[PDB]
């Protein structure tokens, strides 16, 4: 049923190790952060901080 | 003292990006070492 479209290509091995990556808000947006350690999922976090 | 997990370097993996089935090259010759932490578990409850 589903058209299995082969996309055959070249597959050379290469070094692949994760590196840290920050995600930042541009031009007028701010990223909150719950500095509180005991976290519960939803709910209040009376230790918030903007970064 | 040390608990071990036996495993293989698979090739035909299901892509985590979407519904697919990739296939990669045979593993290289040499030592492939990775000393990595474990900071998480994913669990689910029993059916009944």
């Amino acid at each position, epitope marked *: 049923n589903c058209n299995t479209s082969a996309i055959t290509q070249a597959c050379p091995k290469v070094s692949f190790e994760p590196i840290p990556i920050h995600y930042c808000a541009p031009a007028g947006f701010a990223i909150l952060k719950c500095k509180d350690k005991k976290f519960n999922g939803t709910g209040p976090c009376p230790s918030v901080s903007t970064v | 003292d040390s608990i071990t997990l036996p495993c293989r370097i698979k090739q*035909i993996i299901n892509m985590w990006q979407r519904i697919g089935q990739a*296939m990669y090259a*045979p593993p290289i010759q040499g030592v492939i070492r990775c000393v990595s932490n474990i900071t998480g578990l994913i669990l689910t409850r029993d059916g009944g």
Partner: antibody
Framework: EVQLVESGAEVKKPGSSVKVSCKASGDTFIRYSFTWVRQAPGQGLEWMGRIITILDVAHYAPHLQGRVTITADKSTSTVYLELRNLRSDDTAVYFC?????????????????????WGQGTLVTVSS | DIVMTQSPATLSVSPGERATLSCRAS??????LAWYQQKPGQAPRLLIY???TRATGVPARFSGSGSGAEFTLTISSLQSEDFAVYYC???????????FGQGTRLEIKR
């Protein structure tokens, strides 16, 4: 160890299409890779195409591309070669070949390029 | 396609002595050449794969080696059934546009 039986010799006319089946037995059919190779009379082997059974994908030779489709069915566990636009000098002996590549169902795959197991060899002669 | 030229193409050596067969690669095939033996009448048989590794159920007297653009298959002692056409097929390229060899010719000394 594991034998493959090919279909009988078939004779057709130019402008038609031909189909030849190679049936593999002895192991699990789906755990194999199959290469179709042809030999012209008095000429060296000619690599036609390849198919990965676990994955159902084929790659054919460029100069021969466009008139050949290689398929396979795991239910009956056999691989079919289909050739279009038959023409005289294409008279030749056709060979199926199969190679074991590791535990393919679970995810392991070697992708060997050589040929180990062979069919008995069908003969196709297209002429007047 | 991919061309395969060899120089010298073939040399004449009388049967009864040790003979070596040389396969030349147009491209840089690391260890991806296999050797097949075809006596006339049926399908060929793989002997060396990986350009060095012996196939299962084949005599160990045959010895293949080489890399890059130069590969050589050597016999130790000739046998009655070891007079056939030897094909050297490379499979280094990907996607698999593999190309076979040309075989080796031996003439009947009448």
């Amino acid at each position: 160890e594991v034998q493959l039986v090919e279909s009988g010799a078939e004779v057709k006319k130019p402008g038609s299409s031909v189909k030849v089946s190679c049936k593999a037995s002895g192991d699990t059919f789906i755990r194999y890779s199959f290469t179709w190779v042809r030999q012209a009379p008095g000429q060296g082997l000619e690599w036609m195409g390849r198919i990965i059974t676990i994955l159902d994908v084929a790659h054919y030779a460029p100069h021969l591309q466009g008139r050949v489709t290689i398929t396979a069915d795991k239910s009956t566990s056999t691989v079919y070669l289909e050739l279009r636009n038959l023409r005289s000098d294409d008279t030749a002996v056709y060979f199926c070949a199969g190679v074991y590549e590791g535990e393919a169902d679970e995810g392991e795959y070697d992708n060997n390029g050589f040929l180990k197991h062979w069919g008995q060899g069908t003969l196709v002669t297209v002429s007047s | 396609d991919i061309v395969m030229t060899q120089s010298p193409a073939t040399l004449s050596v009388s049967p009864g002595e040790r003979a070596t067969l040389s396969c030349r690669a147009s491209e840089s095939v690391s260890s991806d050449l296999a050797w097949y033996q075809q006596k006339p009448g049926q399908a060929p048989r793989l002997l060396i794969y990986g350009a060095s590794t012996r196939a299962t159920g084949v005599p160990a007297r045959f010895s293949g080696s080489g890399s890059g653009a130069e590969f050589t298959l050597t016999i130790s002692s000739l046998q009655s059934e070891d007079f056939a056409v030897y094909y050297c097929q490379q499979y280094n390229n990907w996607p698999p546009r593999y190309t076979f060899g040309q075989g080796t010719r031996l003439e009947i000394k009448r």
